[PDB]
Design a binder for this molecule. Structure first.
Ligand SMILES: CCCCCCCCCCCCCCCC(=O)O
Ligand SMILES: CCCCCCCCCCCCCCCC(=O)O
Ligand SMILES: *C(=O)CCCCCCCCCCCCC
Ligand SMILES: *C(=O)CCCCCCCCCCCCC
Lengths: 238, 55, 269, 256, 269, 238, 55, 125
């Protein structure tokens, strides 16, 4: 009869506890393992994979493959804005439903760099240069290419290498950021501008499309696990 | 027959199991192994960053 | 741990870490250091909380039913499935095949019921939860011989105590639990289609071993599942559309994301 | 031939002399320096202007009167408009600095008085009206000293800072401000106060408009006095010099 | 330990341990031995109970609410803050930045309520306390799917047992918890001012898993906070004025101390 | 099934207990530490720091910076009393709100020496000597400089070294003393007298001010933790 | 994997931890480290007691 | 797998790619650098902003027409209003810089034309 004494916490069921429980099926022989391809070991192996970003949310294109297409056209001037969305991988309607944004919605904090791979889907005869830029928060979003200028940019020349990767660094006051929005934890703006208008020959289409892909860099990490707001339920499914 | 392992930090925590079945054991929270080049880069011919992808 | 950034300076070469051909089906590995001048930063950040075990290993309620002190509903039964709850089902469905051990915790709670019954003075209720593997005899009443559990495993738990908990092995016939199944049960490509052709875990019955009082009492057993020692293969897109059935992929089409106005609008609408 | 009373501080273009002083009170025993790769988060390479930013910026002089309650200057915001310190601060999302604060006040042998020169890290101030928070225009004063109040500020439907000196606008006892790095300018023995503040904050770098990490306060504990004839206009001049200023996150200019 | 006094004798020199210039911003280090003849005394006195851990590491009630068996208030919610209680808030505010682990103990207590309801015979009440980190779905009713806690952590506790307790890590984004914040949340120096721009710990919901009886019952959950493994930086003056708000420094001016009469009065009035 | 037996104290919640509790957030990665200036390790590091003492409590000066000023003037005689307050660092209205007195109010016992640094804030042309004295309890407070005499004093000559430190020793029957008042645990009296009246030249002010600072010595320690009586509450703040 | 440390006196108390997280551990009551010359004496040039502060 | 046609120039925040080009023509065989103590006169210590000043400033685009004669941009004055290069330039009496001038113009296979891109030291007009 060993003298024991209980501490607060006895007979409590903590959802996230880690204890040993007696097996209900003793000496049960588990069917031997099999090497099945593509095993996941960490959720970041999945967030490091490019997934097409629905930049053109706009209207009913969200109910289509058009959400995925970024319209590019031959103008009568350069410096025009192609697109613009804020750096909120788990919050912005653009990123929230990406492979990266879905995983990020199960966590409260996040930290790291992100790769935005842009692929030009025009004719093999179309040319053009684009200014892909990321401007940290502090002063509003760049409204001219001349304001996007001063930011962290990458001039993309369309050629044989269809795609160009604008890599967004981690420039933050804090170590992590909230997955949900908070202006303390503000992220910045990603904009695209024509550097030199789209030039096409005669008989080739002048309006093309670009596609954007989002993946995490080797320094990306998510913290504090919570439930996604993306899956609801009214009754047990039957 | 105990096992002293490390705690999660930014020490040790001794552990002994009492059950005859491995299913009765605690979760495996400390396996930070990882390999994204199954999904990122499942290409047959190697792709070097600094080089043109299509040549 | 997470990778530290290397101190980078200017560059003027024919090396193009930024230009690629995404058609290859290969994700680019560009890092800040490649498209800008970086400073050296030492990353101590850890991807510990995003391992598959930490993601899935948390008790989730998968279902719950009620049984009573008197009447018709005197015992309950549930054919085991993790698909009746939106929350846990969706996490498991990030992977095509998953393999794991389970930790079952049950939260049994009773409520006194409205009656004209006078002089109620309840005695402590003890409950019996019994598992009937696919093939064994099923309780047809609160008192069929079946509840002897001479070979079936079953938990007897008296109210007011700590929640009954036990763990279970990887009970599958396959070398991994199949989360999806693009097939039928009949070789004639007929019968059932989908994962239900595979679900055969048996039933779970619960009952009051004793009625306890003269007045009515209704109990509600909540079953919690916690995947311990998890292995997951072949990842897939998280569920977009809401779940409609507990036995099939049936969804009602929904748009890719929510909307905003112009491709230039820095704000969700 | 030496003297504990003499001093000369050279930072950039500027040099500062003192013929009567106390020691230089060094922050929390910490002398300012740059951010280490170990403590860094922002991966982009910083701009460290050096001689252009870390130099002696002499803000406006203020008059010490027999009835002055005190004054306060928020820190990043004071030099926010001064030279290249103010420029880099606008073009950059993140910034980090330390300072060498030199408060100057000379009187004579027939004058008396004593000022407390403190450096309050995170001087979060209260509102006159308990429900509101003071306005940005009520808390901040770029290079122009904001002043404490002699008596309680009225709690209408304002956003006025509750300036009564004895609570320091923070609801504390003004006499305990002595924990924060400080010096006294007892006109009897002193001539100036020098405080070298290291970077104090819970994050490696922060935005310089949204957050003012340190607040300088000059509160006279023993009032200015002098017999008639003794010169009446006794000014106080504040000279601050950024130290080891780095800036990460370049973009267009401003704050919004 | 505390320092012992040295045996001192008379003195007649130009050494002046007593005369200084307090303008330097340096506290004098004079000890009895310097201004009198001291005897040797051996001090075994220890400053053990005044370490920051011993000061702060004691369970303090930080808040408490109520929920009921029936009606509207069937579940509770509290946005986490240590600033609603005068006692613990003031101790933490002796420092500008604090960093620590937490130990949460909850004291859940129920009281039978007045009713015309006859034949009450309550069953044991089990409670569920759930944490919803900033961003997760919030319970809109005692029965929304949200209470499945498939990923959110939550405690299920049956009445009459020992108080539910668990510890939590240093959940901040910053390398230390900021107790004060002289700034805004918007770069336009606008929006929120003060510490609330920083508080984003999420909400805490509690509910009765079961009603238990026919009569009314109201419960009161008391949340206790205990800073374990504490680190505190940049000390400051203890709070003089009383607290007015839970989100801001707002105080109502009060005098430096209490009073007495003449500077010569050896007694408080 | 190991035979155990509970001792009284089981399932009890002691506010000051020290036990292990299961973490609600497993394998959570804490944001790395940062060296922030001025770390406190013991509360006595704070009580060893000088803080201005409100000697002139008197009346409404307590609602002003005047509480902090000790009036000194040029008399027509010496031996006059400048001030007087008892040795009660946690109790007397003078010390109770000091850096030392606020910390002392969280503890029940205290022991040690105290430094009272007096700084002369007059004109550079004013002179004067003061008798700073501490008289232990037993016979009342000294009412004349000739009674303060016999105590533990320090004659302060005002000169280039503005300040003078009257250090109060620990002269007690007991090892500790109560922070709250108790005549068993009586402390003594601190008084100040003119040794040689304040002499000023013509055209220099004859009425000056002195300031007093309170800090603890290297032998000071506080014991038995309790709540301060200084912070009240009627409802949870909102 | 236990740790025998000293009790507070005027003996020993063995301790083992059972949890995988360092946050689950007991408080650190026995750290009597101290350094008041951050606050008392934060002056740049050293100030000796027996000497005149201002010379 | 290489090509004389591909390029990538990283300066500060900015990176520049080219999928069709010639070599980089380096000034007079000289690559820009800082002033030596041997060649210096001004005794005060310089400000070398680095990543803040030495980065890619993209001025306004101009339209090449079948009738355009040519264009010219003076050099310190062009970037005199751009970012921190323009700021340091105003607060300072003396300054010294070199440049990486990238003129961009893409047409198609059915377009023709040829521009001379020169850098005239001291174009006194
Ligand atoms: C009292 C003993 C209770 C035993 C509980 C046994 C529960 C079996 C759990 C099977 C787990 C998840 C499997 C999904 C099955 C499938 O679709 O293939
Ligand atoms: C059932 C799980 C409950 C989890 C309890 C989590 C409580 C979080 C405590 C945060 C602590 C004190 C922080 C003040 C925050 C701030 O102002 O920055
Ligand atoms: C290896 O374990 C030898 C040391 C044993 C330490 C005492 C074990 C404590 C109780 C264990 C009994 C096991 C329960 C089935
Ligand atoms: C080092 O600890 C080896 C000695 C083990 C002594 C027996 C341990 C007593 C019970 C510990 C089990 C740990 C609980 C998770």
């Amino acid at each position: 009869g060993l003298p024991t004494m209980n501490t607060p916490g006895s007979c409590q069921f903590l959802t996230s506890d880690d204890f040993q429980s007696p097996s209900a099926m003793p000496q049960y022989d588990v069917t031997p393992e099999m090497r099945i391809p593509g095993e996941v070991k960490n959720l970041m192996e999945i967030a490091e994979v490019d997934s097409v970003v629905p930049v053109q949310n706009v209207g009913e294109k969200v109910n289509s493959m058009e959400a995925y297409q970024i319209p590019v056209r031959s103008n009568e001037g350069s410096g025009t804005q192609v697109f613009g969305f804020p750096l909120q991988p788990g919050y912005s309607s653009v990123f929230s439903r990406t492979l990266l944004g879905e995983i990020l919605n199960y966590y409260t904090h996040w930290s790291g760099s992100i790769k935005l791979t842009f692929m030009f889907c025009g004719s093999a005869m179309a040319t053009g240069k684009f200014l892909l830029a990321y401007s940290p928060p502090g002063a509003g979003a760049p409204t001219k290419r001349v304001d996007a200028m001063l930011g962290t940019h990458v001039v993309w020349d369309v050629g044989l290498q269809s795609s160009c990767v604008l890599c967004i660094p981690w420039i933050s006051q804090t170590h992590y950021r909230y997955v949900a929005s908070d202006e303390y934890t503000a992220g910045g703006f990603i904009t695209c501008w024509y550097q030199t208008n789209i030039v096409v020959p005669a008989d080739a289409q002048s309006s093309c499309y670009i596609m954007c892909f989002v993946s995490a860099c080797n320094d990306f990490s998510v913290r504090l696990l919570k439930d996604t707001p993306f899956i609801s339920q009214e009754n047990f499914f039957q | 027959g105990a096992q002293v392992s490390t705690q999660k930090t930014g020490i040790h925590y001794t552990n002994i199991n009492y059950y005859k079945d491995a299913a009765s054991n605690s979760a495996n929270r400390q396996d930070f192994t990882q390999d994204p080049s199954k999904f990122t880069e499942p290409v047959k011919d190697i792709m070097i960053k600094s080089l043109p992808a299509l040549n | 741990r997470v990778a530290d950034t290397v101190g980078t300076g200017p560059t003027n070469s024919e090396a193009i870490p930024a230009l690629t051909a995404a058609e290859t089906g290969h994700t680019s590995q560009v890092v800040p250091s490649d498209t800008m001048q970086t400073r050296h930063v030492k990353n101590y950040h850890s991807r510990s909380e995003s391992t598959i075990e930490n993601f899935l290993c948390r008790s989730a309620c998968v279902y719950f039913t009620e049984y009573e002190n008197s009447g018709a509903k005197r015992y309950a039964e549930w054919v085991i499935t993790p698909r009746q709850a939106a929350q846990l089902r969706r996490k498991l469905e990030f992977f095509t095949y998953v393999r794991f051990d389970l930790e079952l915790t049950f939260v049994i709670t009773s409520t006194q019921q409205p009656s004209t019954t006078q002089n109620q003075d309840a005695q402590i209720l003890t409950h019996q939860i019994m598992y009937v593997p696919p093939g064994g005899p099923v309780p047809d009443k609160v008192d069929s011989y079946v509840w002897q559990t001479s070979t079936n495993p079953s938990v007897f738990w008296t109210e007011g105590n700590a929640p009954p908990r036990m763990s279970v092995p990887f009970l599958s016939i396959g070398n991994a639990y199949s989360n999806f199944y693009d097939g039928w049960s009949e070789f004639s490509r007929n019968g059932v289609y989908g994962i239900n052709t595979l679900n055969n875990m048996g039933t779970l019955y619960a009952r009051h071993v004793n009625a306890g009082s003269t007045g009515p009492i209704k109990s509600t057993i909540r079953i919690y599942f916690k995947p311990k020692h998890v292995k997951a293969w072949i990842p897939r897109p998280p569920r977009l559309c809401q779940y409609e059935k507990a036995k099939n992929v049936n969804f009602q089409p929904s748009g890719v994301t929510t909307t905003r106005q112009s491709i230039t609008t820095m704000t969700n609408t | 031939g030496y003297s504990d009373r003499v001093r000369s501080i050279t930072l950039g273009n500027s040099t500062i002399t003192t013929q009567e002083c106390a020691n230089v009170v060094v922050g929390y025993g910490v002398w300012p320096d740059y951010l280490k790769d170990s403590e860094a988060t922002a991966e982009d390479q910083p701009t460290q202007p050096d001689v252009a930013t870390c130099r002696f910026y002499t803000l406006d002089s203020v008059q010490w009167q027999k009835t002055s309650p005190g004054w306060w200057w928020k820190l990043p915001d004071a030099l926010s408009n001064l030279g290249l310190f103010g420029q880099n601060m606008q073009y950059h999302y993140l910034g980090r600095t330390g300072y060498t604060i030199h408060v100057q006040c000379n009187a004579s042998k027939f004058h008396q008085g004593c000022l407390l020169v403190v450096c309050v890290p995170e001087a979060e101030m209260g509102c006159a009206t308990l429900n509101n928070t003071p306005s940005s225009a009520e808390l901040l004063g770029g290079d122009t000293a904001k002043e404490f109040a002699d008596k309680p500020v009225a709690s209408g439907s304002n956003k006025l800072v509750q300036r009564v000196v004895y609570n320091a606008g923070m609801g504390v006892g003004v006499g305990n401000l002595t924990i924060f790095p400080h010096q006294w300018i007892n006109l009897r023995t002193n001539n100036s106060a020098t405080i070298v503040m290291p970077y104090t904050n819970s994050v490696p770098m922060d935005n310089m408009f949204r957050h003012n990490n340190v607040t300088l306060m000059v509160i006279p504990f023993v009032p200015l006095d002098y017999c008639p004839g003794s010169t009446t206009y006794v000014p106080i001049t504040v000279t601050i010099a950024p130290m080891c200023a780095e800036y990460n996150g370049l973009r267009l200019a401003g704050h919004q």
